[PDB]
Amino acid sequence: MREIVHLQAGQCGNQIGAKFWEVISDEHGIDPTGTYHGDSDLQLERINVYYNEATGGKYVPRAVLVDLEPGTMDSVRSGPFGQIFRPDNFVFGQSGAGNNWAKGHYTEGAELVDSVLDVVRKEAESCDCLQGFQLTHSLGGGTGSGMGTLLISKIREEYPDRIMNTFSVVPSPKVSDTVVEPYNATLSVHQLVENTDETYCIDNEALYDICFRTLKLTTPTYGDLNHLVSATMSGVTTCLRFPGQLNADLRKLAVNMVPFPRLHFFMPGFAPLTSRGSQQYRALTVPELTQQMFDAKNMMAACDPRHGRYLTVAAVFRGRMSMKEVDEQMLNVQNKNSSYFVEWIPNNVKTAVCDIPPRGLKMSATFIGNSTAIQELFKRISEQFTAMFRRKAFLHWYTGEGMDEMEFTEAESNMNDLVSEYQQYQDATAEE
């Protein structure tokens, strides 16, 4: 019926996808063997969205792992749930990307692309009807960034009537991982704004700070961030996975919170982020959750939303409280905090409550909105890219592959246009 095909790219993308699969398997009652050990009601009917029916009721993942280095497959396969996936989906090459977008897109994206297109075509034909495709990757390298854009372009060209949602990892100047990272970011954002429906912003530094100052974790690691993002996507996806009273789907969210195709970026966020010793001293109510979904402290952005104006807000709840508190809360927030959202568009907050509570936690609610806060990131990326393109260093590597330098010129022109557009829509005055 209505199923979702999932895609994987980049070592960070692969690890977060494995974490998400483990999280959902634990939530829905799946043993690591491959059988079913759940005890719920809604965990059998709509279970086929991410799984496939097979003999003996052994439900199976629907995800294709794309990578250029086979050292990742061995790592992800040795895990507690690594023996349940489809080894055929683990399409890996022989040469690494070396954190090069152009080289991976040109060299390692020509003789390996055919296999992944064939397998995804087989998966698409295997189901009756589909809604969209979810790809989790990162921009920090040529694995997540080099190929995912090409795959997204190919799937758009083949099937234009599908949802293209992604959770790519935005870079940060304070915490970097690649010397040529802003080059890759500038190359990738062009395909993001040209041939992609919507994209969510993911930052590691903000999550690290959030955990440090709120969760107070002894030795925070990538496992924690992977669990956080897995919970975030699960809260996003429960609107279709677990129907309730006011259900929603990805495409309605996409249309309703995108005023213009050129600006499809979002900011996610989960409400209950407390410390270990603070969990049994807590009050589960609406005003507290609204405070944590409204403040910038709980948000996973490495910026300040208070510098701009709110454009589109969607509140996705998961539990059994009710309707009225949400509307009264948003009403009074818009009444008091009048100088934080576009006065021209009233009622910028969307209501969405999932009646099915999550497994292990009772009240849960994610925050999906589009506030005016990414403009600083875009302008600093533009500044660093212009500086780096001034004297043209670290460019012979890209030059030697065959591609020219005009691509950087057109990409920076696009970035200038986009940031100008963002800044002149930020001051969206009523009139003259």
Binding site: K252, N256, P261, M323, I345
Partner: protein, 439 residues
């Protein structure tokens, strides 16, 4: 005879239909199984159930209703319920893709795909009935399903049956509180369709329901079930003289003929009373004059509007329960001389007397208590025009720079329709104030 067919589009329409059907089954003693297993201790059921139900050769009842929705999730939620053995699966059509608060898709690329199916279903249902008077179309304006699909179906029904009554029941987007953002986008298009192709339309909201429940029912934590129960009680009260008899029978035609003073002004002001809880029905003497006076109170209206701003053109009263004619006469004499209630210099009086012997029933687990009698109000006044004015202002302020319009353009739809709907609503309003202007 007096038999109608009910239409339930969208999640709200389906849930309202479920509430109405369960209210009818409990009020007539209809068991959920579909037969009459009551063979030891009888508890009622010997009445005229043919208006809504059908009698088979084995003593089974088949509901006569249309449960259609573009999203299969709601149909599935109804299917897993305890009343699944009552209706038939063929009346609950699922879907692959839905609209979900979108008009263009649900009117061109979604609704147009399933047309022959629902038309054949409704033709079979109509043929299964002998006497047809009107319909009960249950949808919503915010919901894209219950707006686009509802409009496209009702146009065909209008062109296929010109001699039958066409009712309307949906939800108005409150100016203060709302669920979605693109609600007035759907509303501006649906209002034209419901205006130039239908005979009457009933407009209600939920914020007034919230106000009345917190003020009277005194619930700090309300829910949709109470709203649906209120709507079902209103609907049953309206169609009370059909399932039963009384001193003065008021059929659908009988009231709808006078409820429409003009082809452009057919938006009455419904008012249900008493809307009270259990503890509010024990130490409170209940007569007719007080509740009739309370019916005209703005705090009791289901539309946020001060009646004192305009004036009344047509008024319709209905009653249900042990009511005495002298009390009604006294109430009429009182209200006709009240200086607070405004009316035109042209209609000195006009109303109906609906006497229903059978009192309204209660629901085990509900909030309404055992009340000896009930009353429902349907008035026509110009003071309600502000809601359309607010809708026009909102549509204007969001249409100036074309917010979220590229989606509808890409789906395929004429842009000038927005101008067409805007000017149609402007003309409708202008007519409303001109009517409200006395000599």
């Amino acid at each position: 005879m007096r038999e109608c067919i009910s239409i339930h589009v969208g999640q709200a329409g389906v849930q309202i239909g479920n509430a109405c059907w369960e209210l009818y089954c409990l009020e007539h003693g209809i068991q959920p199984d579909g037969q009459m297993p009551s063979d030891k201790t009888i508890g009622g059921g010997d009445d005229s159930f043919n208006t809504f139900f059908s009698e088979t050769g084995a003593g089974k009842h088949v509901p006569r209703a249309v449960f259609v929705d573009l999203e299969p999730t709601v149909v599935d939620e109804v299917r897993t319920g305890t009343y699944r053995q009552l209706f038939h699966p063929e009346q609950l059509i699922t879907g692959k893709e839905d609209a979900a608060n979108n008009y263009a898709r649900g009117h061109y690329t979604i609704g147009k795909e399933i047309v022959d199916l629902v038309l054949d279903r409704i033709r079979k249902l109509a043929d299964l009935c002998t006497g047809l008077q009107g319909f009960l179309i249950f949808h919503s304006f915010g919901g894209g399903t219950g707006s686009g699909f509802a409009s496209l179906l009702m146009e065909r029904l209008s062109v296929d049956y010109g001699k039958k009554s066409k009712l309307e029941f949906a939800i108005y987007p409150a100016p203060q509180v709302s669920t979605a953002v693109v609600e007035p986008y759907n509303s501006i298009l649906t209002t034209h369709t419901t205006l130039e192709h239908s005979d009457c339309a009933f407009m209600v909201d939920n914020e007034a329901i919230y106000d009345i429940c917190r003020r009277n029912l005194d619930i700090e934590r309300p829910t949709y079930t109470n709203l649906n129960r209120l709507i079902g009680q209103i609907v049953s009260s309206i169609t009370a003289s059909l399932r039963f008899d009384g001193a003065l029978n008021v059929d659908l035609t009988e009231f709808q003929t006078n409820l429409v003073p003009y082809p452009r002004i057919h938006f009455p002001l419904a008012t249900y009373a008493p809307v009270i809880s259990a503890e509010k029905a024990y130490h409170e003497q209940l007569s007719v004059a007080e509740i009739t006076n309370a019916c005209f109170e703005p705090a009791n209206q289901m539309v946020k509007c001060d009646p004192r701003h305009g004036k009344y053109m047509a008024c319709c009263m209905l009653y249900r329960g042990d009511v005495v004619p002298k009390d009604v006469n006294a109430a009429i004499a009182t209200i006709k001389t009240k200086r607070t209630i405004q009316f035109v210099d042209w209609c000195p009086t006009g109303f109906k007397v609906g006497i229903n012997y059978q009192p309204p029933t209660v629901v085990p687990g509900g909030d309404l208590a055992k009340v000896q009698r009930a009353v429902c109000m349907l008035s026509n006044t110009t003071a309600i025009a502000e809601a359309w004015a607010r809708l026009d202002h909102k549509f204007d302020l969001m249409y100036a720079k074309r917010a979220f319009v590229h989606w509808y353009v890409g789906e395929g739809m004429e842009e000038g329709e927005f101008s067409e709907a805007r000017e149609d609503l402007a003309a409708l309003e202008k007519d409303y104030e001109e009517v409200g202007v006395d000599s």
